[PDB]
Amino acid sequence: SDVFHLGLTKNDLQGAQLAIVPGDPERVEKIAALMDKPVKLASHREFTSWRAELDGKAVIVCSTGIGGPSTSIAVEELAQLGIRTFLRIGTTGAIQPHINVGDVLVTTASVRLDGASLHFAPMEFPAVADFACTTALVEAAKSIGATTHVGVTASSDTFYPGQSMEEWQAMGVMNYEMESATLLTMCASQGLRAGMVAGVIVNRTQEKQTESHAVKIVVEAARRLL
Amino acid sequence: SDVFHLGLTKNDLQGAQLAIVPGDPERVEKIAALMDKPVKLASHREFTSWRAELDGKAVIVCSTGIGGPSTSIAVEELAQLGIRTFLRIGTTGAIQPHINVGDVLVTTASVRLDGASLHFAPMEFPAVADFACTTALVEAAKSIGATTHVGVTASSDTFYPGQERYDTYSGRVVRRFKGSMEEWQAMGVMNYEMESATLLTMCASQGLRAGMVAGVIVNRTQQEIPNAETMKQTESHAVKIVVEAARRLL
Amino acid sequence: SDVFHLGLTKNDLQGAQLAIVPGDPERVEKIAALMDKPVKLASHREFTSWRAELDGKAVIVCSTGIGGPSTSIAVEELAQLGIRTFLRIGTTGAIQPHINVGDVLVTTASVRLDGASLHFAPMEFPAVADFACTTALVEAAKSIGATTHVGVTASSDTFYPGQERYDTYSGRVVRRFKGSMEEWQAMGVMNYEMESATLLTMCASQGLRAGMVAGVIVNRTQQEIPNAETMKQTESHAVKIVVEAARRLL
Amino acid sequence: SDVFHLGLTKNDLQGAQLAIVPGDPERVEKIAALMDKPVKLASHREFTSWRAELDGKAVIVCSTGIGGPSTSIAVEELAQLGIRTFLRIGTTGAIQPHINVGDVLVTTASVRLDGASLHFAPMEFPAVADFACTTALVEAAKSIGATTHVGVTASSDTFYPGQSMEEWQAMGVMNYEMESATLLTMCASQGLRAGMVAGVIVNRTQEKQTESHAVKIVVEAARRLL
Amino acid sequence: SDVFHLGLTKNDLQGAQLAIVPGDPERVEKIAALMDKPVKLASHREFTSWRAELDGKAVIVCSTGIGGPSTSIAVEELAQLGIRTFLRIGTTGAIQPHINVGDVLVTTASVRLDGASLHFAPMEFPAVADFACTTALVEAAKSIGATTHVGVTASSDTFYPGQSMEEWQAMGVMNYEMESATLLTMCASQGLRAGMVAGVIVNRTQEKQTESHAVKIVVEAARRLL
Amino acid sequence: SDVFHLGLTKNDLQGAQLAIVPGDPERVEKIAALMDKPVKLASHREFTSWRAELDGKAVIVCSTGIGGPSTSIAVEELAQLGIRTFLRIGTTGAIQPHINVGDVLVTTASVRLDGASLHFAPMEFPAVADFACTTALVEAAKSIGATTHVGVTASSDTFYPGQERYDTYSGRVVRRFKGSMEEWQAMGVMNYEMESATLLTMCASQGLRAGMVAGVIVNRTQQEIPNAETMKQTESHAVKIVVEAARRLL
């Protein structure tokens, strides 16, 4: 293999320059299934990867595992293999009263409450998404009639956030997860494009289906970015 | 007046909800002139305000002065007066060799090398621009055929050591900033300026929309010096872009 | 199940109070096999759990996955299920030239270059191993004739820049970590890994016992590359040591 | 011009080595009017400068604008032009019960709650005034019969301090403003002399006139420092 | 003298490679008295040193004075003279309800609430004891039938801790003192072995004698480490 | 006694409200002797206290020992006993080439490279000397014809790495302090010592007056070594200055 963890060679990518990077292998398979010529490439620890095609161009789908640290390995190794654009899709709760289950969130930038982002840039540097990617996600969401919110996501290392959430709600933060701060910071500080979308599956308060549409949205955004 | 510094009442704004906010008072009238019915509202310190009209809606142009503390005052008072969308327009130097004089920069987020932003959100919070504003600015730039770069800006509380300038009285840069420019360059940072960390952080954390566009009038990494029109044509283009963006945000 | 991620109920553990926690699911069965009545309990994500029996007491083997966030989930859920003693077993590279492939490392405490540990204790708190666990591991290593090094490990939230690797896409390491490896080497740090700061800090601050042992399978400061058995014999020995240590902690 | 912002040349200074640096142009004019041969030199953005003379020696008066960032530009550029001693005068409130409106405060050092000071020295370094300048301000205040307090000032970036004031009161802090931390730190860490004086115009509680005497005090201190 | 503060030469040590480092000269004398051929070597400021012998090998006993700063001088200068292993003994209170007056505490690592430790390693580095030393202290305590607790100690610069203790109690911290963080960090980050033991003399709540046995324990641990 | 460490009662001080506080017990009697009716009060650890009389007022001389933690104990107990003015007297090395052996340093404020000061005020607070004390010390120095430097001192929790000394067992200085001496030199810092950050911060934040004077007895940036009287004449002069300053503060 060309890389330490993923079990992949450059040849495996067949010229791919974009990867979709969800957290788990189950989601990887569902995403790959939406595209042309899906082929499972490798599976080692947290990192299960598939190849597929959009408009005749190769695309990779690879799981990141849980948290910034695992994510940082997947993204670096995929970059080593030639990937220059990364789209993450997740499912999350929301912390704003006006956000409804089933809505789609596109992250412009993340609150850096993680540890791994600091390994790429000092805290002053913004965990900001690439403009082309963010645009493609919003456009894709619009094209399937999704109700979309665009804004800030809080990103931390703990499943049980905080070490405060009312503080983030008052500051307009949309939702919480664990990987976006690392992904966005490591890409924005290294000449790689990244975007982030999530389907809302819970909230206090707010009238697989949700995961399904978020998955379709990330694939259609990928198409626009080739 | 209704606010401590701007010397404006709410009625002066005539229901305006978008402001264009350049740094320099001198540039205010020029921007207001591109629009309908330019009218000078007030002038106190470096806070010069004009009102104008765009597609039948009232718009404000108001200078911020230099630095985050001055900017925070302007922004907070304007927000008190009902402004909900802020478009920063500037001229700037670049720190990337491939960015040319005459190019336009649209900022998605800023490195927070300032102090005032910290009064609005902890450092972990991103100094991020509003998506609609950024989109409007990018589309307005495209509309006039400008060569546009979209990305990160470094926002510093100083013009000199925080921008790692050594051509100074002391010739010294404190440890924090020694080698910092090369690091920001490697991280793809486009340019330095002094106000956006405050503007973007306070807006993003307070339910307000903000964006920023700037024309490149110099590039310290290029040997060639800026043409005689070191500013003008580029300043004019940036102003055209910001007004056209505002038109899409009304 | 009784826990969010592991898919285990308390009864599955059969009163087990010690867990061996490797990183890689692949390594779980191999460890369980050294003991009595290996039985696969569950498998979800990178959390593969087996139960086994040692001297008539139930023992758990459960993978943590990569990094502190994954590890914290495994440890907290295992603790919810009654585990009070955690033995981490791994294979690792070394950063000291005198530490050889095939050697065994037992960690007394870790440098906290991660984020998840901070959710359990402020940075001032030491990522320290339990004395009984460390003693058990050191004695088990001695028992099989292993060449053993006992000391500090650096626990990083990244595999690449936090371990000051330059053979990367960007070839860049952020200021914080530039020259960091040479500093850790001078301070007598044995090796890098990615999970122990979280494991040790959360256990030491929550009344739980933890220790960590690892077999050296590579040394980036030595020119000679690891023998064809770059892992195997050493991986096998480390597993033997961790099981023998567990026997003394039951 | 010899400098990026102020619109001045070395020749404009006519050998001046001391500058008085208030915040606003109105105050600049009032200060210049107290001295001999006042001449307005330039006005660009926040920076309005005059030249004048004390005891036959040139002195500059130049506004700084609001906050450490603007102040840092004025001070650096004036240093480039040959200024080696800087005196700031302001008007402020007080936070100690024994300080009366009309009293004069001379700052020995400032609490560094700003951002710009960090661009000159790490937080451990004291934002301390020069001894000669502090002495000259106290002596000048005494010479006009002013009631004077000498001590610590809290200096921050916000008009609305804090991001606590009871904490500063309990620690003996006299008053609050926005520029002294930057001024004092950038001078004390760069071989420049600086001093700071302010007239008290409000307080809970404590029996243009106040601005007037503070202005006269800074001018008479300047005379002693030539 | 070979060193700046201690008033000692290499020759004075007669090949000693281990030092016992209590806080005060009174304790130094008591420790030396337990060993063979005790000889007082020097006394300068906080640093009173004796030489003695265990199993025919020279050992040094030297007071550190109060706090990390004084301790850091004693340890460095003794290292310069050839000492490679350092054992501290103290007497302290305890903050855990199950710890009884008269019990012995062996410190595995310290909470770094001091200033001097940062002069040797950044905060992320653990203030951890050497395994051989910790083992020798536990074994020595066992050999005289002492009730022993092994774990974490909080170490700060103030006699009056905090600038919170319930926080440390909840985290399992055994006790508080002022020197261990510096000692352990400076040794663990510089290739020197160090251990720490203390006799419990007070606690809420928990059924010279205590100092006496802790002193005997450190001497018997020293013997095991030669 | 009324205090935990000094072994003094309030009556021992006889209403004294000024203390001279050298580091070394050895130097206490010598200072007390310059004044009227030197009387040894007590001696515990490195806390030797004498009482004396100056112009008919009781004055205390009491050693602090080495470092901020020891100093904080002495200062807080002395303040408990009614001392409101503290004058630190020391001998020191310089780090500026133009500062000569025999010169006198009066400290306006200190760089806080210690830990104990942080228990009294956050780092943002200045370790600043009282104006009356500093004035008294500067005038007393002038009175005896001393060559005097007035300015910033760096106050470190260590003698070795915090003063960037490499002539040590390890020969290593941690990143924080690598290149730090050259930085303090460029910033005009006069010298290093180990007690003033604590002394000045605790006094300035607690309504107490403090100042510090020191005689230069060595300069590590000069090739020439200090004369045989490497200390004496200079130590004597510094003591004369501190007593004369105290006379003006009574």
UniProtKB/Swiss-Prot annotation, chains A, D, E:
Matching SUPFAM superfamilies: Purine and uridine phosphorylases
InterPro entries given for it?
Nucleoside_phosphorylase_CS, Nucleoside_phosphorylase_d, Nucleoside_phosphorylase_sf, Uridine_phosphorylase
Subcellular location(s) per record? Cytoplasm
Q: Which PROSITE patterns match?
A: PNP_UDP_1
GO terms for biological process, alphabetical: nucleoside catabolic process; nucleotide catabolic process; UMP salvage
Q: Which GO terms describe its cellular component?
A: cytosol
Could you tell me which pathway this protein works in?
Pyrimidine metabolism; UMP biosynthesis via salvage pathway; uracil from uridine (phosphorylase route): step 1/1
The signal peptide annotation in the UniProt record is none
Q: What is its main location?
A: cytoplasm
Q: Which GO terms describe its molecular function?
A: uridine phosphorylase activity
Catalyzed chemical reaction(s): uridine + phosphate = alpha-D-ribose 1-phosphate + uracil
Q: Which UniProt keywords apply?
A: Cytoplasm, Glycosyltransferase, Transferase
Role description: Catalyzes the reversible phosphorylytic cleavage of uridine to uracil and ribose-1-phosphate.
Protein family membership = Belongs to the PNP/UDP phosphorylase family.
Task: Give the protein name, as stated in the record.
Answer: Uridine phosphorylase
